[PDB]
Amino acid sequence: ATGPQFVSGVIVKIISTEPLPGRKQVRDTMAAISEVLYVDLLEGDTECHARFKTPLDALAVINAYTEINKKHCWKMEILSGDHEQRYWQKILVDRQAKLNQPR
Amino acid sequence: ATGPQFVSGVIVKIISTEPLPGRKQVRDTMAAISEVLYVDLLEGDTECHARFKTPLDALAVINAYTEINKKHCWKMEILSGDHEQRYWQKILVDRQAKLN
RNA sequence: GGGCUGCAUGUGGCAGCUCGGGCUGCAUGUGGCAGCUC
């Protein structure tokens, strides 16, 4: 009603060696382990974020090094602190913009 | 495959003192009397042509003194002979041009 | 895709008009039609 609701520990930040694959390819990578609520990815970028339902889901994605990291040559971390807070600020802004689009 | 089929007596030429109204207006004026097929009208011209399905349609239009001649100060005539012939050459040329 | 309208909406858009473009397949002096992307 008011947008995604905050929980801490659900934001995965991915850095890749090659340019990132289609939003569905990235989502389906992690969806193989946990429910992915959202994939925030400029196509062809080498960094993106993925938001998860619960802290344990994001942790389980973080912990699949062979399945994910070594297949896709990715580094993955969970945001915390001010980096987390600023990502949730970006969520807010992105939603506001989409909701105020003219037409 | 080859366009409209020649019928004699189906081409009315319209002459006007002032510029003609839009092609939709000319078409409606005619169609409330007879079955119009085509209205050949260059925007703003003083003359135009209208082609009907049958000779009788065209004659009903020229006989509608009430409904046209007095409401719009138009002179009308049904082409025949060499003028009619040239108007059909004009049809052929227009068609070939739009196809190209 | 532009205009409008409703809806959904960080979740990836939907629909109805309406106007005009790109690819196509028919029609066609008969003033285009149907599709697919905008």
UniProtKB/Swiss-Prot annotation, chain A:
Write out the annotated subcellular location: Nucleus, Nucleoplasm
Q: Where is the xRRM domain?
A: 5-103
Effect in UniProt of substituting residue 38 to A: Reduced binding to the 7SK RNA. Does not affect binding to U6 snRNA
Q: Where would you find the membrane-spanning parts of this chain?
A: none
Q: Which superkingdom?
A: Eukaryota
Quote the annotated effect of residue 51 to A.
Answer: Strongly reduced binding to the stem loop 4 of 7SK RNA
User: Domain annotation text?
Assistant: The xRRM domain binds the 3' end of 7SK snRNA (7SK RNA) at the top of stem-loop 4.
The record's subunit annotation is: Core component of the 7SK RNP complex, at least composed of 7SK RNA, LARP7, MEPCE, HEXIM1 (or HEXIM2) and P-TEFb (composed of CDK9 and CCNT1/cyclin-T1). Interacts with METTL16. Interacts with RBM7; upon genotoxic stress this interaction is enhanced, triggering the release of inactive P-TEFb complex from the core, yielding to P-TEFb complex activation. Associates with box C/D small nucleolar ribonucleoprotein (snoRNP) complexes.
The record names the disease as:
Alazami syndrome: A syndromic form of primordial dwarfism, a condition characterized by severe growth restriction that has its onset in utero, and results in short stature and undersize. ALAZS patients manifest severe intellectual disability and distinct facial features including malar hypoplasia, deep-set eyes, broad nose, short philtrum, and macrostomia. Some patients have non-specific and inconsistent skeletal findings, for example, scoliosis and mild epiphyseal changes in the proximal phalanges, but no frank dysplasia.
The family note in this entry says: Belongs to the LARP7 family.
Q: What does this protein do?
A: RNA-binding protein that specifically binds distinct small nuclear RNA (snRNAs) and regulates their processing and function. Specifically binds the 7SK snRNA (7SK RNA) and acts as a core component of the 7SK ribonucleoprotein (RNP) complex, thereby acting as a negative regulator of transcription elongation by RNA polymerase II. The 7SK RNP complex sequesters the positive transcription elongation factor b (P-TEFb) in a large inactive 7SK RNP complex preventing RNA polymerase II phosphorylation and subsequent transcriptional elongation.
Q: Return the protein name.
A: La-related protein 7
